[PDB]
Design a binder for this molecule. Structure first.
Ligand SMILES: [Cu+2]
Ligand SMILES: [Cu+2]
Ligand SMILES: [Cu+2]
Ligand SMILES: [Cu+2]
Ligand SMILES: [Cu+2]
Ligand SMILES: [Cu+2]
Lengths: 334, 334, 334
């Protein structure tokens, strides 16, 4: 059917780890869903030491916002590159078919904008990222990536095909940064992106990230910014890594249903302790909380988690269940 | 039902790669299974060059012992930290639900002990490891990890749900060590763990293990300590890596049925050449031997295997089957 | 049945990324399929900078040729090591059962040959590689690896067990090289393999490839050597990595049906954006092209792809489908 006869809905995006409102089960027919993103190059402090990088972002955040649509909707993205930026940008959706995922059609210089439309033919969570020719990994590893979730029209289903409904949804973007280091091991500082470029490339070629972070910084998902839930709540965590393999794990919990490679036509993996999300992929895990307290959600290369930054927290409220776990004899001398 | 009315069984653990006696099919109702482990900090020689590290162990071995229970048993672990140790330790079971997998409830200083109980609600093989706050990867990468197998009450089943029964079971723990190196590349030596700590952290941040070993040392599963089987025997190999991805492969064989991420409610992957066990996971592979001779069981990053130590051997006895493989023309000049 | 009563077919191998002619559905009974490979040690230029390595090849190419047989055929390989070579070689087939995959029976010095036969009992794509005792990773990381596809006798089937038929097949071998570097970071040069060996070992122990390439060189699958297809064509891409994990991705497309770990008794994963092929494994992905133009096929660690060489191109001809993707507003100033 002609695309102009379809309903149009405008969505205003929210900052990760939160997700714009949507329906899990499609309450309308196929729609054109309109999104707007504004590219912002900005300085970002990424660790406790105060290390500052020139970040490249969709909509001011690392990661970019989670977009949510249904299978066989059209996504129409208006991408704006304001004159206050210095670099050329575009967008590649792994959800889309053709033209390097939209990248060949979305090249915007500072002061320009573009509008792309594509049909979301496959259900799943998918990465999107910047991909300007000749400079792809530098943009991606400077923060310029996010995800899109294309839900099946009748929502998520379990391994036997019965409905799974989430009560909350969070989006964790995991970012590998490669801050250039001198012979002594200190982090180098640069006046312009062009002066930074070759040293960025050499740092990248080490294949050894200096920082691995959730939501753009060491400790961004802790303390006052801890994710929250209650005992009994069904939580979906969408997790993306545009460049590098990760292995999420909820310390004290599990992934009850896991799409490790993120595509909903496949049955979920059950009862996972840890799952592998390949670089260039987004995955999703569903968990029902059974105990209260503090949970850590980490990349289970524990060096990556506790030294390089790939750890966040859940604060969960509710009743303690002594049947599931109890201290029989509390720590004491003998 | 009240936990005090359940049967109690005490299990004495054995040193890997062997596994304590158990039943595959549950011959009793749900039980409380009592285990005891004694933490031992000790010097360990880890390679042929005689490199010696201050190891941190459960029960004197790297890896710690494989514990075996059935789905919906209770595990009751008495953890003892004797006064002859120097550090604080605890335990996190990926099998357990709540309190950072038991870690928040098991913090023992030297001279203290504790008893934790938890319900084994999910069937699978799972990692356990030490996780003291602020120092997690150092303890884990010093050897302080093992695994627990929670069998389904009616044993293992194949992809179509028919019984799979193993005749032997082995447990291979793969350990990544990060021995600190100077500018020349030699391995540094330290007087106390506290003097070692920052250099341990910096070595860990390289993300490049100096040693990757099975059962605590280069060549621990070779020669007189080679795993054994006979042609026709069904062998289960449980394989864990608490920190880093591995990819097991039986040179000359296959994984007939493989739970790569280790959770038995999922159907196994069939006929695997090599399988990926994510860091922070335990997996299990079942193979029926069809040929005699020497097999190597390796991490199939072959550098990790043959230079850094992640290789062991099976010696298999029995009849050679010329139908499956034969030398038609033996190596000769022309 | 006695092997001498079976039909014999001789196959002449072709250079990757092309694949010798075969039938997907087995048009004969079980056969002995005869292959010949000649080992060739040669100099190879692997990057745009002109870096030259002493390569070790099966049949003159990196990767070696894709062999294709059907489940329960016999593979009979005549392996020739001519007197003009310097090193000892053998072959291990992950497809085979026993004697280190054939490696214990195929040790050929220069001037010698051997003939091995094995039964292809398991359907799938499998790695083969050189594995001389004491020197395995050096040979494998010098190019001495390929793959074999053992098709099910009734061809490939989808997740529901209905026929999947490919119109074209390509084989991409991904090779990690570890070219030794001095303190300044330049690539060292060597007079003989024996003088190269320890420095090869030390470079390998970094676990950081200097080059990651498709079909033996940076840009080998671009330009005039781009893979091709037409809109509507069903393409199977077989992808192997003998030593190191990879994560293939078709920029602008998907893996419609993916055997990530490559074994055809398992149902395929659907609609993959990116998939993980563990080191020591071969995988296969099936895609029906829906849009024309240039596609990049990359390892989606984008540093590995665009800086270290793990990127190739598809040129696809046909009709542009505006329904699937269109530029609504082309890039312009506002
Ligand atoms: Cu950009
Ligand atoms: Cu991409
Ligand atoms: Cu400890
Ligand atoms: Cu853990
Ligand atoms: Cu060789
Ligand atoms: Cu191999």
């Amino acid at each position: 059917v002609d695309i102009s006869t379809l309903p149009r809905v405008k969505v205003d995006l929210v900052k990760p780890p939160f997700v714009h409102a949507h329906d899990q089960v499609a309450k309308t027919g196929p729609r054109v869903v309109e999104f707007t993103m504004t590219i912002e190059e900005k300085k970002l402090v990424i660790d406790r030491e105060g290390t500052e990088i020139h970040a490249m972002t969709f909509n001011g955040s690392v990661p970019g916002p989670l977009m949510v649509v249904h299978e066989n909707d059209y996504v129409e993205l208006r991408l704006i590159n304001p004159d206050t930026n210095t670099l050329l940008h575009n967008i590649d959706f792994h959800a889309a078919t053709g033209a390097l995922g939209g990248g060949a059609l979305t090249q915007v210089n500072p002061g320009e904008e573009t509008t792309l439309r594509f049909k979301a033919t496959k259900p799943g969570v998918f990465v999107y990222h910047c991909a300007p020719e000749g400079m792809v990994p530098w943009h991606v590893t400077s923060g310029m990536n996010g995800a899109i979730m294309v839900l099946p029209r009748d929502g998520l289903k379990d391994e036997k095909g019965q409905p799974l409904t989430y009560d909350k949804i969070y989006y964790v973007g995991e970012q590998d940064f490669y801050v250039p280091k001198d012979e002594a091991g200190n982090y180098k500082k640069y006046e312009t992106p062009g002066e930074a470029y070759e040293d960025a490339v050499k740092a990248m070629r080490t294949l050894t990230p200096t920082h691995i972070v959730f939501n753009g910084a060491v400790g961004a998902l802790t303390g006052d910014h801890a994710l929250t839930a209650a005992v009994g709540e069904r939580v979906l965590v969408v997790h993306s890594q545009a460049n590098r393999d990760t292995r999420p794990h909820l310390i004290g919990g599990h992934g009850d249903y896991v799409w490790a490679t993120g595509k909903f036509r496949n049955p979920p993996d059950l009862d996972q302790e840890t799952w592998l999300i390949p670089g260039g992929t987004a995955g999703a895990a569903f968990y029902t909380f059974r105990q209260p307290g503090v949970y850590a959600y980490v990349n289970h290369n524990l060096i990556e988690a506790f030294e390089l930054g790939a750890a966040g927290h859940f604060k969960v409220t509710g009743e303690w269940n002594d049947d599931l776990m109890t201290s029989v004899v509390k720590p004491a001398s003998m």
